[PDB]
Amino acid sequence: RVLDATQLYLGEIGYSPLLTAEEEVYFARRALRGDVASRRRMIESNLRLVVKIARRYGNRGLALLDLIEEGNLGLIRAVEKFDPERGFRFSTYATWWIRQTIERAIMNQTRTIRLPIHIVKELNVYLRTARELSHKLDHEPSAEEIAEQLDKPVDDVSRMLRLNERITSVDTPLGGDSEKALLDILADEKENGPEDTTQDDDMKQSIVKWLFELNAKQREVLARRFGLLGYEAATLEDVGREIGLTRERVRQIQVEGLRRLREILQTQGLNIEALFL
Amino acid sequence: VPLDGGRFATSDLNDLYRRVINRNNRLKRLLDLAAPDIIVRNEKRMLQEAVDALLDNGRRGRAITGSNKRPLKSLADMIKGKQGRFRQNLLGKRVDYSGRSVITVGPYLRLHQCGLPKKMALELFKPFIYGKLELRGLATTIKAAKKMVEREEAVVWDILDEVIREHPVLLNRAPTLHRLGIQAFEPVLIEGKAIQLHPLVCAAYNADFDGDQMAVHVPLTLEAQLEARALMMSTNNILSPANGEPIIVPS
Amino acid sequence: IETPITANFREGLNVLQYFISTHGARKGLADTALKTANSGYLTRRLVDVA
Amino acid sequence: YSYTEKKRIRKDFGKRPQVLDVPYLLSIQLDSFQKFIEQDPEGQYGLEAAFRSVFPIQSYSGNSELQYVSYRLGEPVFDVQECQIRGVTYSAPLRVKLRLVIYEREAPEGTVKDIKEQEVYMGEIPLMTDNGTFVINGTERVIVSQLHRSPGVFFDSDKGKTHSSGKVLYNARIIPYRGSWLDFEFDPKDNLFVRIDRRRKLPATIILRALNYTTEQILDLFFEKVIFEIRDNKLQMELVPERLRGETASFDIEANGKVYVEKGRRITARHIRQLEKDDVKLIEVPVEYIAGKVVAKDYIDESTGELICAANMELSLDLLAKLSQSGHKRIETLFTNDLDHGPYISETLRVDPTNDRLSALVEIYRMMRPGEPPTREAAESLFENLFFSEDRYDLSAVGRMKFNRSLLREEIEGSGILSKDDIIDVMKKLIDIRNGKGEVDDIDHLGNRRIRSVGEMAENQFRVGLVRVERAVKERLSLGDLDTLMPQDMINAKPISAAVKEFFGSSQLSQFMDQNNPLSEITHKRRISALGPGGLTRERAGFEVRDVHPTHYGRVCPIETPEGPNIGLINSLSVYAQTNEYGFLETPYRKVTDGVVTDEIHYLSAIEEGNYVIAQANSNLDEEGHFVEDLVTCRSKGESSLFSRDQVDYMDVSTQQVVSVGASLIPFLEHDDANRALMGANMQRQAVPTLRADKPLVGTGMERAVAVDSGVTAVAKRGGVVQYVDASRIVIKVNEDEMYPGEAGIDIYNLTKYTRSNQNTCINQMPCVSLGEPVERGDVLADGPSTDLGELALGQNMRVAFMPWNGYNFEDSILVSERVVQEDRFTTIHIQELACVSRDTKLGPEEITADIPNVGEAALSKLDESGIVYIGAEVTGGDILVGKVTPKGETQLTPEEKLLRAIFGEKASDVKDSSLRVPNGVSGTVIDVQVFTRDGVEKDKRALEIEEMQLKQAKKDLSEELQILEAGLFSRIRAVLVAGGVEAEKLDKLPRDRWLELGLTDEEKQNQLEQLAEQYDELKHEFEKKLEAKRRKITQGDDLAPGVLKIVKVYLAVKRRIQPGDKMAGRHGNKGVISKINPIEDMPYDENGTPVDIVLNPLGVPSRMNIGQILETHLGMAAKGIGDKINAMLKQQQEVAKLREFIQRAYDLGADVRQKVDLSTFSDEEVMRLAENLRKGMPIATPVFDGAKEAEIKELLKLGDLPTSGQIRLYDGRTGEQFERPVTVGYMYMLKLNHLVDDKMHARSTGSYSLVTQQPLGGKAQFGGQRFGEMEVWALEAYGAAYTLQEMLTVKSDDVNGRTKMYKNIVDGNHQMEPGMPESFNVLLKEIRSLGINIELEDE
DNA sequence: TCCGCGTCAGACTCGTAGGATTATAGCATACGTG
DNA sequence: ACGTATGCTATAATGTGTGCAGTCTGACGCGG
């Protein structure tokens, strides 16, 4: 029989009313006043019109079946707000809705990174201006060449072209043959390997040794300011909250702790060795 | 995740998920409107198409193709066959303390020996240098030991040379047919980018010096050093397991 | 072939004697690449059960 | 002979004079594209075809339409020079003229209402170079020619679909160039079926009903007729004597007066002539004979008007009696035969469930569009659209040609659509083959494998651009306003541009061609593949395809193909092979007229080769006459045997036509196994050119042909004297005879100097001519990177000795002297290109300054203020080439860093570091740096210093152009002026700017002075706009990717020396790794003292069976022996006459030497420049199969006072005592393969990690560990080594806890096992849960 | 249960190479947070 | 106020289709 979801629906619309001028008015007049059955008919009837409009709006974002669904929602909003009293036909008024609802739904579900309408709307005029120029320049227009025709900013044109930059999936064959994908190459940013992990562990254990090698009040005041041993990274003025309660004596003792520690790095073999780093 | 080139990259799952959620939310919208059933039917068929495409894309019908006219990689696909997690990212693994290079002959070596380039073994035994360095007191910390190695200063070669002595290394040749496709030796540091292999065990690997490459692996744990010396040493592996016959016969 | 190759490598093959040598050469080296997968797949099959 | 040949002559051991000289290498590619752009007026080809095919396009209503007028190619925006550097396509503007015509609706056809007309751009097409390359994004790329199944008809049969039946089921298939497929196939019950697109299987009479054919016409088109008359009482039947042939007499066969055959007896050929000579027409027969026979036409009762029996119905006794009394005593039946004329359509109609035409179009429609209710138009439109519309279907010229000659037709050229005739004719020949006559075609025959070069494929891809525009045109025309809408508003230029760059990029045929070797370039352009789109696949590829087919003879090379899974599909073209005008291949052949081997040549197609018998080139001509021997070894019908003189029709032209270019360079190929010969020709393509181009002592002669045609050298367009020689360029003055009278006549050749290759190697052009040298037209002026006096120089020859050496040549391992390394002769050059990109991140723009945070003054020493390394600066891994900085966002200064940045100070700014630094390991010399910037942000000071040079160097370069062009232009006027008003010095008093002021009398030469005067001004005005183009492009901003602001491209030049691990080989497939560079003290040496260069293993020879290398060695030694004698006489400073006698005695030695070079013709000066090049060794040519034999080589060895044997008395260098017995020594031309060890070795302890698998990455490219696969794993399982494996599953790979924890334990010394559980498994858990499956870890 | 035909499952192991898309109006009040 | 989002316009228009078709040996799973 038929096991394609496409042909099945396309069959069901093929057995649905095809309304006359005066028929549309009869149903529509009752549809506004809520006849229930009337709203269902006008809709069922003009599903055929939605498909013909979705035959041109394909190959842009979603599939043909995805365009019809959202194209049907436009016919529904057209039925929710049609004027039968006006002598003008329905097929005319409904087309404005079905073309709109489709374009809008493509603008959202086309890009992975959700691009709102404002940045997109403008991008189109920049691209459609590129058409005019390309045909008469016979040269794909630059960011400047587009900016000189619109008389608009350089960075705007450039930043709008940056958002046009599309994606390559991390699961995309490299070389058009089973070999390796981008995931088998692209490294992990967050976690750096043991060598970088042990750097900080060994560097920060060496400091725990260097602090117990300083003065009792010098490693208290120096550590609790930077937030090394304490809980919160305080300032020269804020070390007074603890027991210091001083502004001059805290600053002289902080730097006294650092000067004795600078000689501890000159002797152990760092100082200018670990200055490049 | 974003590329270095300002581009982004997404897995095909995210794309397949957006197909499911869009259609599912559109069904919520149509159930709000009390739309005619004919439309609700399409929406339900679509929803199923999307769900079935997410679990296993290429199965029920045509697999939903994407950007480069190729089919979207689904969930099941990451568990499925060679290219799945099992065979590719679980039973087979890229491994640290590993290097490969063109092999050449080692007619001076004894059976339990193999040439290992210095700059190769340098990078391979990196944590063992930093370790023996802190012991002697030459490095106070590890980033200090890191720079000592980087500058390639003379006395660092002698430390590297110290750790490697009485330390076996695994030598593999592709393809790994039988167990003897890997044998362990005592590395001999040699100045040059070529590995030097013992002629008699060439038979086991089927290694021809016509431009062959052999993978190196360092046994880290003391158990691995004992395993390599006990089981996987070239001297302890003479006869083939297939036939009670010497595979290290002169040729 | 009813008529085999009379010459050897010292004497030199003629133009066809080499053309004939090709047929056997390419098919022998075709089974080095393609037929290796059946035997390597057998290794895989044997292992899993054992 | 020529001058450039007079400098060094190659001794040719050929004995088969070249009647056909080797053609130009780059020809097919060039010709292919030469068709695509070619604007043919009527005979549409390439673009002209694409437009006439699609256009004119008309709206969906059909009131408005777009019509193609004419197109054109503008000159390239950026030329090759610029394109190669910037990094954008070398393409030309496509300007096509369109015409929008609109009709009146109520009126008939108001065609003249608005004939709008304008010119429109759509897409820029990559042009082809003179080398046959396409410059895509700054890469010379090659579109390999495809090899695909030729369209038309094809008969096949699965020799046992169901080996159950084991029945050979025959099938036919119509293959178009565009359109749907049409297959016909039998079945176990011999019922004819049709499967359009190989879809559903439909009865084969259903398609005939669709072509309006009644059951009667179907039976009156395949089967014959059997007249059955019922006279009075006796039933009678017409007999054609030749019918009851090979059958049995089921009844008693008797005539007007005679019983011929008895019941149950075989009717032999005698009985058939017995009846045929008696002139038998009618025979009385029984009524039991018709029971089984099928009635032909319909038979209505004359009386009632009803069908007594319908057409195609098995008759019976009662039906026949019903027909006899109806009033029909003339009955027509079918001619069924189980052996010859088979009853198939008959039994097929009994399965066929259709009825009339209109019902046959239903099931055809119900097959392809199932579920849609069918109408009269939908069913008719579909079927008519399939194989019967000018739109959908196109067999093409080749399609109809092969289709016709497959059906033994009348026409070569006919219609693109299938006619009724065609279909039935195809079903007929399928049924012919089923009967017994007719043979099936096979696909492996090259008569069915057509070659498709680029130009036709560029045409195809250009059509899809037009097809994708067709959509946008029609829909915008119909609904859009007629008047307002212009034609370019409806055209889009991107769909064409995108569809063409799709081809010039993503296609399997469009790839980068090797350029590390002239042989690589020329053999890669002469590559032919079956893969990619519209071809085959490794997954789909069989055996019989790959296997060498006897059609390949002369067309395709038997020994040229990768030894990888893509083995038999990829293939190089033969030497003298060329494309058939339709598509197939063709090979040259000497026609034999009335026994006389005429010099007239005919390129025989793959089809006509089978027809004539073809003698081999081994056959001997009688010096203008015929074959010396009565019997000639020949070949035909794909087989080989001896034939008589008169029977020979054609003959192989040369002895090298069987092989390709790759194989034509191998000397003594005749003494080499095809397996090693293949590898030898495959590695000869991988031969990196050396520092100093060394000519091959042991060549074939093809050497020069390759080097010259490769387009890597610079050959003279016009002969004359080199006015000026220079390292950068060459200026040559043309002779009067060749020089044109209009222009000055001084050619300019700016030689390509050292710059990069696609394989990161050197490209240089050194002048091979001296200052002020007389050069002939078409002579090599500058040599390439691997060429020497025009001849190909891939690797280097050296004294080799075959013997083992303490196992340092174990398995093909190589032992090379230090003396080779001292001469730096195998020292190849590598040209890497590192780039540095300034991007636009979300945080802000990046720039390029010397200001880099956290740096040593040591790093910024080689950089300038701008932040780019100086030209000529040596660099090493870690040093920074180009300083870059990117913006740094919200940065959490960790307490330990806030304290460390507050201890030493040096507060870093809000900018990140990402400077391009030399990759860890690489080290070379920067030879140049190129800076690309967008049009905006102010520049670096170094970018201004480089603009200074480009400009002031271009101002000089153009000044030099107009200067020397002036001198050559007045040089003419000076000679013109003397003719007439003869005055020497008096004319040369005042300056040369007042020479156009002087004239001559009313004469041709007065018109000449006016030409040169106004052409001097033409160059004077041209010079300004030439300067404008240079100046502007030097200040113009190149267009970059979105996000990028500017780029800096660096060119390195490492000098890598040979070392252990380097891979080298001969050209006989004799591979090897260098194991040890032996001391000169230790190298073996002859009694006389000179040491050996390489010591090879003799055991790499018997099993290999590549004895060509030994002959290469022996001849090389002989050749050197002669050079050593000439070297001695030139050192001794002897005489011209003494050298003349010896060298004449050398050139003339061979049995029938092809070249007979007399030296009495050579002048004294010409002899000494020759001898000076002969002293390194007399270069010898050994044609592929017509090479030198032992008699000739051993005779040459006696001239060199070398041993007849070729084995020398060798002494061990280590010791000094002699080896126990002689060893072969000679000069073998070896090569340095690209597989160098510095580019191979890798090591890793810990580095990057994968993105999800969280195991390390792959390759030295990204610094990744070696993979330990399952096979590698089972090995450790077998040993029992459990931790060694668990160690390689966890800490060395994923286990995030383990890897870092273990690292810290190793530095502690405690190498302790600390497992956890690899991440890649924790992924697998959730991945199965995401699939809706409860997978939890059930505990103890 | 048995025999033909449909779909669905695999395809020896490691190294290296390189690139690019089309298009979604146009303007005026409604909905969300410093 | 700035960014995102929702809304309306009224000539008539009412059922899609596109795209690789020498892979292959082996093995079931629904009808017939």
Ligand SMILES: O=c1ccn([C@@H]2O[C@H](COP(=O)(O)OP(=O)(O)OP(=O)(O)O)[C@@H](O)[C@H]2O)c(=O)[nH]1
């Ligand atoms: O596709 C291939 C081809 C060849 N090889 C492997 O590469 C090597 C090429 O062949 P070898 O040169 O090793 O041959 P051999 O020692 O067995 O014999 P002789 O040359 O002495 O006669 C063999 O060991 C073969 O297994 C592959 O692994 N795969």
Ligand SMILES: [Mg+2]
């Ligand atoms: Mg090998």
Ligand SMILES: [Mg+2]
């Ligand atoms: Mg070998």
